[PDB]
Amino acid sequence: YSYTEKKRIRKDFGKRPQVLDVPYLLSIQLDSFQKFIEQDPEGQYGLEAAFRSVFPIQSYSGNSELQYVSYRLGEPVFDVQECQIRGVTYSAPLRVKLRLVIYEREAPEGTVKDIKEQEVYMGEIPLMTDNGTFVINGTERVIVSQLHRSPGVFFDSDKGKTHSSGKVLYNARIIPYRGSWLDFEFDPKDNLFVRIDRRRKLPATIILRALNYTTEQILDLFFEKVIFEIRDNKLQMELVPERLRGETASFDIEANGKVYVEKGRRITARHIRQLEKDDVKLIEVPVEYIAGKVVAKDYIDESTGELICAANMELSLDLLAKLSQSGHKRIETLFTNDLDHGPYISETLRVDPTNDRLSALVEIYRMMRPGEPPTREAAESLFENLFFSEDRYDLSAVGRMKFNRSLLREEIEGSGILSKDDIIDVMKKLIDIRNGKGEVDDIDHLGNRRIRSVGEMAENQFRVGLVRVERAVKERLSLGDLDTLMPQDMINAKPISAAVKEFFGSSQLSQFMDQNNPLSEITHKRRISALGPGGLTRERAGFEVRDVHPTHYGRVCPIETPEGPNIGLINSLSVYAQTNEYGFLETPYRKVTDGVVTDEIHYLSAIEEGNYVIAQANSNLDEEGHFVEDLVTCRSKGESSLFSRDQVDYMDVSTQQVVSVGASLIPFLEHDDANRALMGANMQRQAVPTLRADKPLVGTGMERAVAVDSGVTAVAKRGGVVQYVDASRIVIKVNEDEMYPGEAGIDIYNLTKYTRSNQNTCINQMPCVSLGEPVERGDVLADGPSTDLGELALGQNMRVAFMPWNGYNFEDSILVSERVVQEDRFTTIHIQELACVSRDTKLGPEEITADIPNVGEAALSKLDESGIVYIGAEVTGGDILVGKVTPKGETQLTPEEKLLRAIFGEKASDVKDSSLRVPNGVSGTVIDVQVFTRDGVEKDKRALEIEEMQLKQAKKDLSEELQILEAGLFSRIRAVLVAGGVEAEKLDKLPRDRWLELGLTDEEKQNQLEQLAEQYDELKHEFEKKLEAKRRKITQGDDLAPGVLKIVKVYLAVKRRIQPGDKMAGRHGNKGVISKINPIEDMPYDENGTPVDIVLNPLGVPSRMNIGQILETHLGMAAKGIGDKINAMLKQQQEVAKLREFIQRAYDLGADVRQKVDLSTFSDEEVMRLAENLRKGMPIATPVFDGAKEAEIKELLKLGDLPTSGQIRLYDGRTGEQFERPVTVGYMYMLKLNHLVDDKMHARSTGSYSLVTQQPLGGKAQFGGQRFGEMEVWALEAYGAAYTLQEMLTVKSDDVNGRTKMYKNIVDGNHQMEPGMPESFNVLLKEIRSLGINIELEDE
Amino acid sequence: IETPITANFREGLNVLQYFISTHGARKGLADTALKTANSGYLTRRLVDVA
Amino acid sequence: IHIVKELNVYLRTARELSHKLDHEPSAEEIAEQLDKPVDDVSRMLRLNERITSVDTPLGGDSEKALLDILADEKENGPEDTTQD
Amino acid sequence: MLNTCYRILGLKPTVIFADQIMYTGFAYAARSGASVGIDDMVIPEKKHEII
Amino acid sequence: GITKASLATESFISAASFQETTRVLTEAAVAGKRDELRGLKENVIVGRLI
Amino acid sequence: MGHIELASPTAHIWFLKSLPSRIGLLLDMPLRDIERVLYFESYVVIEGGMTNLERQQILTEEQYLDALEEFGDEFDAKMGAEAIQALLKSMDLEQECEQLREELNETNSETKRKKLTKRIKLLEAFVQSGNKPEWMILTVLPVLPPDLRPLVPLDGGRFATSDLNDLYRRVINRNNRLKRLLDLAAPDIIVRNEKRMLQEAVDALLDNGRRGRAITGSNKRPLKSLADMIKGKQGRFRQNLLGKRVDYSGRSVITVGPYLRLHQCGLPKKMALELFKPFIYGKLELRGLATTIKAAKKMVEREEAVVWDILDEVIREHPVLLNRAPTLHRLGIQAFEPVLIEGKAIQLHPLVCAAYNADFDGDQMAVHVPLTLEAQLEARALMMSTNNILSPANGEPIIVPS
RNA sequence: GAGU
DNA sequence: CCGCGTCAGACTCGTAGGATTATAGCATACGTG
DNA sequence: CACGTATGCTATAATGTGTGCAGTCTGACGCGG
């Protein structure tokens, strides 16, 4: 075990050896975007791919052309931190080297005319953070991967389109990555058609005619042949035995000298096999049989040279006789059959109005460009530019791959352009499917659904920006001068920058990162969405795609997706699942050779998975041998059953791989209903971090991995000893063996303190190490906001009892002890952000002064000279934070105010009042202020004071950097100087500033001194430039929006304590709202005196079927029982030996505990720190389906000396007498969700009204009213409450004079109704009359 | 489905039983979100005519 | 036309600046290039600020537009009317 | 019970009676001490056999 | 049926407000139809007493 | 309102595209036929005095050239909205009604009798309405008032406008260009294109995505036309007229009140302080505590101890309405006597949770204040929880212990 | 994302 | 009949603000302090 | 006259659009061929 694990070991109840560890959870994000920026030399990827796809391009004339050389990302002008504070996007400038080459017109391709080569800027591309976010306008945003139908081929059929007939019409669709769609479909008359971009329908043969296929050839492609030899007089036919099947024999079928089948007789298997065995080839047949057979090829009279019969012509007795006498004694007709080989193309040629190739091209052209006179040029060009042009069409390697595999080809990669064979083969397979051989795909199968990550999407939008600029370039190249015109003068950055900014901004997949919880971020970045551009819509979404598909096993979680309209579309990735190189999903499986289960792992794609039989993870292994049991539970072809041991090809790696990350955190998932588990996992994401990070007693194991991988915790880059711990930072000195010989080797981590989250929560990092502690690489140095010693800590476990209590836990309602509030454990921090904007108006600039009309001294006390509240100041609703004043223009003073202002003098001043104040009923402490001024406007006094702080603090920070770096660097040189000329304290006597002149003998260690000497001066000059940069940025006058002169941002911190109305829940989908905070005197308490913290209603269990919470409670109680035993032993101080005895016995409890934890390796002190942590309650890991079983939990309770039932006798705090029976009591890990009543409470009497409709506005932020909607109206109508109704329609809403009159009446007591007519109605009439419908009021 | 869930909640379902349960569960939950529109629209038509 | 053409020269100049600075230029950086007042540059960039539709629904969701939030500030409430 | 009371006694009595019933109901619910342990979920010995 | 019955009522305000509003209004405008406001819908639209 | 004088007449799209055709039904002219005429693909005969060529018979461009030399003069056939308007003007409804009624008696087939009875009722109703078919065609275009298509400045010096203003700007530009092209006596092909242009913009103004492509903004999204403001859920009726935003309303999270009696609910002090603002001011003036309205306002802002006693006085015997969404039956809204409580959530009585389907897993409810003596009485008598026990659906008590 |  | 088109598709609550392009260069002409 | 807003002319030859998305829902009810 690691050093951080020595501090607190979790007890594991798992039995299945995990052959594979969980991968880096944000793998997808990082790999993808890395590929996008990664400059690949040949195999174009991301950026490189976009350039090569478009470039090189030439002008319209063809003489001038632009070619791409190479690109480079500039380093970002502002780092992440600065970007977040300022509100700027974190991006890298994209400079691209381009070469303008011009050809001569008189010379053939005179490339040595004019070649201008230079580097042009064109847009800054947003960069991805270390943890897979993007910083856009100062907020962290995550681009969620998308899931769409893979480019390629797909066969489908509307299952009974015409509902009367209910005939199944099969269709093929070729979907490219870029281009027009090409659809093949059947009609009810079994004729094959073609459509482009679902336009009007065309006979399918028309497209083959475009590809230059004569009628003869088309039939030879799709059809087989029936040959007829005409010998002497009688007609002979060439026979294939297995054609005549399921049919009725029309004539007397005989051969040489044996009659087989009679007229009107069914031809069964036996007959066919008889005929085949006899070796029948030719059979005499009646002439009358030919009537109905279609001739395949053309036949001409050799004598005359004219057409006797054209191809695809139904044969008759006349034609046949004519053909015989011309001299043709062999006739190719179409093999064809109602059942098996259907004549589709034959019939489609009869419907085909075109003749030759050119005619076919014209008809295609006339479909898509109807009316417009066709020209041969335009038709040829159009058809080629549809699916046969490199520019406009591209299946992509994924499209070609999927296409080739669906057609059962051998080669995966190839042409992105459609070849002739490709089309034909799609038609053939479509026809095959019609005949009955083959089946249609679905769409829901993950073999047909592909995942499109961030890098590929950025790549696509970047291609678009290129294409827009390409238009502009071509246009300017044509008219442009060859000599004067520079390449960078033609290029505009704006189209590209616009396209990209629009993606990372406007796109649905790009959204505000959900960061009210580490889990929330990590799962959000592991999300997949079927929505957005190139995907489904909520409206357009069916039920088929939404529901759980067999292929989802090991790839997508079946238990993680929103219960909204986004139910089937948005989905979290399974744990072990990964992105295939082509973009499909794949899951790890352990290969089994001859029964023996090897440790080699293979990731299987969806398609590959169906081929092999895969055993479940729950099969019992025979100690590195094979399956214990002769019958094994396995699955293949999407279906599950029993198999023999040797039959098994693979097996599931982990028991966890079926579920997502979120669902894995749920202990005892196995005993919860899936519905509830879905809600539990969803609600776990909404857990708000409390003040005190409490670890969960009853965990799973995933806690540690989530916290660490999320990146919110600070982890150690290189192992070594901690040189300086601090609240603000941590300095760790690295071990010699890992410590590089170049630098000093002292790592510095500044910790991010009290910062605002997107949900207005509080993000602070705490150090979790002691000063001078030895630490291993990859250990947690500092905990993030909801983490504890490396583990995920979303909520807080507590003592729960399940019982009714006077209906205060009625319908999930929660009765909680005052103790919980007193200890402030659920109390939460919220950091809110208030801004005061000073804009420039037509009348003049708004000012941020403290000098405001009508302000009390009390109010101005907290404001400084500038008009800004001081740091630290406690505020409450109504207090002014940032004073601001605005120039008022004339106002018509009513004659009364003229008289009054003449009486009092009080002539009204030029300035008004737009000061930013504390929103009503929020109250907190101002913890930081930031000021933004434009470059030219005179700065505030307060702004100067903030800059003073920043400058001097920046100098200290950088000075400490070079000081501790200088100290660590000379400490090395001191050691190198010892290796050769050791004079330890004699060298330290004279000052360290005069040290590097001393050398050594001519050896490699003398060169080591040169390396440290070169780096020390490098660090010296580097420190100069760093500080120059810092100083510039602090001085830097910010470029804000046009109109805005200066902005002041204030950050309040509020302490929110829990209260009735707040929302709490566990991880089993058990919600509840706090109803009552009961005094601790009233709380049920056990024999020992210990009172319960929460009382939950047991009536919210059997209906819910979430039994995980009961198991959690029992295991929770046992965990705490052990904790109290350890706690008791520590208070007594027995001795190390005794603690070690108990703890060893404890760890090694379970029936087949996987993890062994021998305490003999642990030194006595290590044992003490461990026990110190375990006293609060021994933490236990229940893996998902590999969890603790009932037996194991009861055994743990006996070690706690707790009852096997887990029920204890409880006493009523009010009466003192016992409750009649035992109640289940233990620790459940619970969470306070983001839904604070504070945010929810709202009330309005009278306020602003809407613009046109005149009715009150909506929303609490705008001080809005609740909507009384149609539903709500109907209620009142039913009841017959007429006045209340009318009241809500008129005086309470639009009726303007009515509302004012009503208000006056109410203040004067008399509740008189004085109603009129709603203004919205008036508006309606006017809108109808603007339509040109006369709608008039006829009065009485 | 031809194979029903033989196990129960107290005993704990295995990976495959749990997965098999999902389908039906989710179908139900989606029906809440999606079908109530049509139920409510019926209510609206009734109301309008009465 | 005069304002439009002025604004266009400010734009073309911004483009040259942005190519060489790697970064899109500030109002004062463009002004320093033209040897002109920052207030002039600012006023022109303010005019370039293009309009938003009141009917456009907010938050990528066809839920409710700007109109739904935007009050009549001139129309005081029943409170103010009754006070008069 | 409530229905019968409504028909014989009337509204006022039923309203009072309903409140009263609510109070005593919850009151005794709590006193009972009734809760949910894993042992209440009795299994049938004939479970494995039937299966 | 319920939909057509509601659209067949003499009140075009009730009809138009329900559904099909473009068609309802062309019909009523051409017919020169007058609604004397008997029903509840109609009154609530004008903010009158039920 | 204002108006615009259109240089060329234009069809009202509602009485053209919205089926039944109305205009096509009235002329007995297929809709495609009308359109070929409107878009100037082909001419229509308005009056062929020579019975050789009859009324409403479509002629292509080359068809109009043949009879030009031959018959000419004595046949008038024209193109576009002008032609259709003229055809409409000159049709006499009375006469053709009688003619068609005569034909109805000859051999009335089932579907023929319906179509004929339809036109009969159209012609009858047209004469009864006093409407004229000319009016199907617009020469004057109305202009909606400014405040119903507002141009407002946002804080930052930004402007926001209604889409209608963009649509109107298209119409005006195209119409005024047409006037210019006529003053310049332009060739007829260009006159045609502008007339089509005008009609396209009008149609977009009235109903955008009806006829063809809806004219789009830079955002890709179709501009919101006039008809869109009346039509659908977002439309005036459904959204602003059959339902409204309402004053004296609030909302919060709900929680149990087991201690409550049946006719009561826990109402947060802070909520009730706001909801009853004017009643508090009025009582403050009767007590002579507050001199004026402004003083009373500042007194309630400061939340003085006397104000709590006054608030307690007013809320006595005053019913408040609680509502839970969705309001499926009438009991989803019930009246209660409020009991003021310190704490921000509303407390609901257990027994009526059934009716609301209210379970406290985060549910919220809306609170409404009946203002008038009439509304208060309606609430206490008809809507009080105590008074409404039985389901109106089946004769069963809905307040049942659970 | 919250109850239905 | 067939096929193409039009019409509807539950009720409240929430969060957050916000983004694109480009129109030359100069001389004469019209309206207000 | 100036300041703000508008109308105007520039002289190699150049002479029919496309572009950017849309993604295909569903059960029902009418309306020309």
Ligand SMILES: [Mg+2]
């Ligand atoms: Mg609920």
